[PDB]
Amino acid sequence: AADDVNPDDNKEDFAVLCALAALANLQTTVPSIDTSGLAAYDNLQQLNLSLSSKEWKSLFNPKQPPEGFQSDPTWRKQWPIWVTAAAALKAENKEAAVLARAGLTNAPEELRNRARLALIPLLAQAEQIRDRLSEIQKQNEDTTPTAIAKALNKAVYGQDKETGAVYNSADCFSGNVADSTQNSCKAGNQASKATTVAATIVCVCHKKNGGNDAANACGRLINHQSDAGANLATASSDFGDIIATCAARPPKPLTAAYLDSALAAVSARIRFKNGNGYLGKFKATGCTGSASEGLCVEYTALTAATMQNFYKIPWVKEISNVAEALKRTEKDAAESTLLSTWLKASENQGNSVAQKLIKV
């Protein structure tokens, strides 16, 4: 009976599935967009405004530019930035602190004017940097620990929640379990069912009731204290025994590379026979939990040339979406470090122009 499903026959599949299951209820840090440069740019805006004429300052003390400028593209772009700067300078002692940092406390009118003009090229250089940093901030704002946890809890348990996700067949199998194990343990088909990591573990590892089971296929250390019932009717109790043996922890912070390597590893283990793909040992008839048949997920009609469809199965899609988001955020976080360092440097440069202008 070496060709039947025996204890340990799905042990190596189970190690990969354990790694994936450990993405449930995850508490990870995400790469941070370093937005300290936005504050540095806002300080430069405040200096520029403080040094401006009374006629210019009068424009801010409105939701839109004044008559004549409501259609000027530069005024439309800058209005909120200017308004924020004006608002921040209303705060007690703020303008005095801004001028002091710039060397401009009690500055003569001519020096205030020459200093403001000296900021023109500096601000023009910094604008493009600040706008890229603001774009990065916006583009990555949905890449958060909470959004990742929810997506991964959909992947593992079919539950769109940040924490407290647990095995429930109503969620782990699409529409709950099917009339038969064979139909429940199919994915990608018209009647796709095994659409989460947890359902995949049930199908690859469960002990069916009624004899002729493949208990301990996923490892001899599982203590199957019950069974999954007939046709997975009571899978939850058995799943709890299986998952109790899994200790996996992903690297922290979670990376795109780690998720991509996990999906690649599964892709490398799926085997094609007679027009379907299989994860877990398949002998004949279907993925039924019976030892002489199979303990597996049947990727119905999956072939090497249609493998793109594996990436559309819910759990795979959710993990893929997390990986893609992380892939962008990792790069944009590293970019933002330098954008923010550059903008802080521009702030320091702005605070130095008065010394040059005093000396001539």
Ligand X SMILES: *[C@@H]1O[C@H](CO)[C@@H](O[C@@H]2O[C@H](CO)[C@@H](O[C@@H]3O[C@H](CO[C@H]4O[C@H](CO)[C@@H](O)[C@H](O)[C@@H]4O)[C@@H](O)[C@H](O[C@H]4O[C@H](CO)[C@@H](O)[C@H](O)[C@@H]4O[C@H]4O[C@H](CO)[C@@H](O)[C@H](O)[C@@H]4O)[C@@H]3O)[C@H](O)[C@H]2NC(C)=O)[C@H](O)[C@H]1NC(C)=O
Rounded to whole angstroms, the Cα distance separating 296 from 206 reads 10
> Which one of ligand GLC, ligand X, none interacts with residue 324, CB within 5 to 8 A by kind?
none
Cα separations in angstroms, 142 against 30, 139, 188, 238, 254: 11, 8, 28, 36, 16
Applying CB under 6 A, among 209, 292, 337, 349 the residue interacting with ligand GLC is 292
Applying CB under 6 A, among 162, 293, 298, 347 the residue interacting with ligand GLC is 293
Q: Of the two residues 2 and 124, which places its CB atom closer to ligand X in the complex?
A: 124
Rounded to whole angstroms, the Cα distance separating 24 from 158 reads 10
Pattern 237-256, ligand GLC, x by CB under 6 A: --------------------
Cα separations in angstroms, 73 against 84, 138, 273, 349: 18, 21, 62, 28
> Which one of ligand X, ligand GLC, none interacts with residue 291, CB within 5 to 8 A by kind?
ligand GLC
Report the nearest approach of ligand GLC to the CB of residue 6 (Å).
Answer: 10
Site for ligand X, rule CB under 6 A: 45, 48, 52, 56, 69, 72-75, 78, 116, 123
Tokens of 200: 């995949």
Report the nearest approach of ligand X to the CB of residue 116 (Å).
Answer: 6
Q: Of the two residues 194 and 287, which places its CB atom closer to ligand GLC in the complex?
A: 287
> Which one of ligand GLC, ligand X, none interacts with residue 123, CB within 5 to 8 A by kind?
ligand X
AA letter at 118: A
Residue range at the interface with ligand GLC (CB under 6 A); choices 12-20, 180-188, 290-298, 331-339: 290-298
Report the nearest approach of ligand X to the CB of residue 105 (Å).
Answer: 19
Report the nearest approach of ligand X to the CB of residue 45 (Å).
Answer: 6
Report the nearest approach of ligand GLC to the CB of residue 288 (Å).
Answer: 6
Cis peptide bond N-terminal to 31, omega within 30: no
Report the nearest approach of ligand GLC to the CB of residue 180 (Å).
Answer: 11
AA letter at 164: G
Q: Are 335 and 328 in contact (CB under 8 A)?
A: no
AA letter at 111: L
B/e letters for 241-263, b = 16+ CB within 10 Å, e = fewer, are bbbeebeeebeeebbbebbbebb
Rounded to whole angstroms, the Cα distance separating 275 from 67 reads 70
Q: Of the two residues 137 and 292, which places its CB atom closer to ligand GLC in the complex?
A: 292
> Which one of ligand X, ligand GLC, none interacts with residue 56, CB within 5 to 8 A by kind?
ligand X
> Which one of ligand X, ligand GLC, none interacts with residue 73, CB within 5 to 8 A by kind?
ligand X
Tokens of 207: 């002990």
Nearest to 5, CA basis, from 234, 204, 275: 204
Q: Of the two residues 32 and 70, which places its CB atom closer to ligand X in the complex?
A: 70
Binding site for ligand GLC (CB under 6 A): 1, 4, 212, 290-293
